[PDB]
Symmetry: C2
Subunit: 358 residues, 2 copies
Amino acid sequence: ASMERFLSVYDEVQAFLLDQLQSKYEIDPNRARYLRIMMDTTCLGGKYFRGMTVVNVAEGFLAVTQHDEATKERILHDACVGGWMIEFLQAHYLVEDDIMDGSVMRRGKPCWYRFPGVTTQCAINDGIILKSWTQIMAWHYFADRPFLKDLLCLFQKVDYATAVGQMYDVTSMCDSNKLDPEVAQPMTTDFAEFTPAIYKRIVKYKTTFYTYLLPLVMGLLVSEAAASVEMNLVERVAHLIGEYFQVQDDVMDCFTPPEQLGKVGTDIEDAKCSWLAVTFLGKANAAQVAEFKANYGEKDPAKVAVVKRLYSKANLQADFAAYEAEVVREVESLIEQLKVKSPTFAESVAVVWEKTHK
Amino acid sequence: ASMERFLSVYDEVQAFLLDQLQSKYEIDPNRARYLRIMMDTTCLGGKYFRGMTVVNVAEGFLAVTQHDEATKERILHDACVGGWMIEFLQAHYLVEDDIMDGSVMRRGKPCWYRFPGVTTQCAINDGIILKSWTQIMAWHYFADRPFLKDLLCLFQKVDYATAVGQMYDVTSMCDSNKLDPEVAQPMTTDFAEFTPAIYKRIVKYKTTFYTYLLPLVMGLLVSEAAASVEMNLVERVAHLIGEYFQVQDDVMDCFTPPEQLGKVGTDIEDAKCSWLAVTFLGKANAAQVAEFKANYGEKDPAKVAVVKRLYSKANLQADFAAYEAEVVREVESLIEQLKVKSPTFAESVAVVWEKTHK
Ligand SMILES: [Mn+2]
Ligand SMILES: [Mn+2]
Ligand SMILES: [Mn+2]
Ligand SMILES: [Mn+2]
């Protein structure tokens, strides 16, 4: 099974990293144990969607390409390692974003920095280590691979894009013209920057590059198949599926009970430029906009309840269904275009869409 | 002048980074301005010792190697860019370490995260961007260079080592056997881990790799001269000079007035494994150790004053002078050994020592 190989490689990668800390970085056993627990707590327990996308893309090409058995095994091992690079990159983001946002829970468990023996003082550095481990992995496992340079270059550009996206995200409730390191940032009062275009830019950089583009292209690279596809189509379809992913996340933040969500959603309190706020402001009458402005972005539970009420009364299910229908058209169109050069890869993308959509 | 070229390249690198944000990352002008101010505030204003070491090593080899003039200029430009990679890496560390430690000032100015329009929520991500910029620089300026892979590999291993060193540093006041993410960490009461060996491990990883080893080897790489030297000697001498650097920093933290230091030193309050504490515990009688334990690691100003008194009464100037004399012997010995294969590089190391020592 794909999952079974993927999880076995985690054990191998963990052992390599911790053994190297002992043999080359002079680490002692208690700190090795701390880092092992940190790695498990921050990297394990999700769905491994991103990492497994690398594996699944690679498996698709193995099914139609002649290889020695040892080569099949090496490609699958490379896909697993590259998948864990992305999972560790996500772990880095989640650790640091939870600190930056003051989040409380993540996947039914306390955020890493809130563990009693961690604290922010250690957790910021723990998140730095998680990202450094992605590079240690690559240089060790891919040292002699022909895709090493392309993979490292891709990884770093996606990582940079994601940090730029985090800036877009955490500043999305400020007026751009008032941004200034010397002046404490007030929340917007006109919400003029709550537009579809601006929302799409947040999501594209914050989410879609590392969640959809990177796993797909990494699967191509470890398969030596990047010339088998039109890269502009891979970008466009990743952008599309990633945006749909984030729209779903945004809806759930407001409307999924905390036990199922795994956290208490705070997008309203945090004044996020979410799909609900943008779409509501694309629909609302004057009265409703005024009420939204009077209540959005405040921890006060009665104000949050007014915003959720406005959202419920706004029939945003209709907008979501129409958004979803348009995304189905465009994603299907792009999958069709991908078949011109690689039916195999087009099928992998169809699977990524089906897992995202349904 | 070397400094004049180095600072000119900053302007060039800044322009490249910000222009690329506009042309490829969809940035708007106010956020470009924020990032420009962030870059200037976090990267400028120090001595540029690390960055200029790259330049000076490269200049040493230019003086004795035949090159076309355009090649001399390209090598110096590469040395400047590689120097700014290290300066931006340091900027990353300082931003994140100041947040992790709750520091107040850095170089006579508030720490970046304490700017009113920054906040920890933005500053953690700003520090992430600073490090991502080091990689954007390398891939853009060194794309076709033969040293690209060696440089990237070196940079990432030094970066990893530094994060491991930060872990050693911020955990240095806890008993290793009690380290545990599930349990809030108490300060040591026996100080058994305040030893020269353990202190040297903190310093080696936290400081010496990125402050001394990386600039020296980067200067070799951009000069295509790494085979001109014995790398084990470069490591040993970097370790030695870097440790002396940190010992000086530790003394100043306790004894240099804040205006000259640029901050209010808090190593005693923070219970740091500093050279003063280790050396004091290497000298003290039972009575003095007991008093140290009763007062170390507490913000209470009268307790800090008791520790400073113990340090003053302990005649640690004698230990420092004897430490310094031994470092002079060993550094001179290693410079002599370096002359066997490269007098030019040995001279660059002598300059790095002279700037550190005097
Ligand atoms: Mn966030
Ligand atoms: Mn969300
Ligand atoms: Mn620190
Ligand atoms: Mn210090």
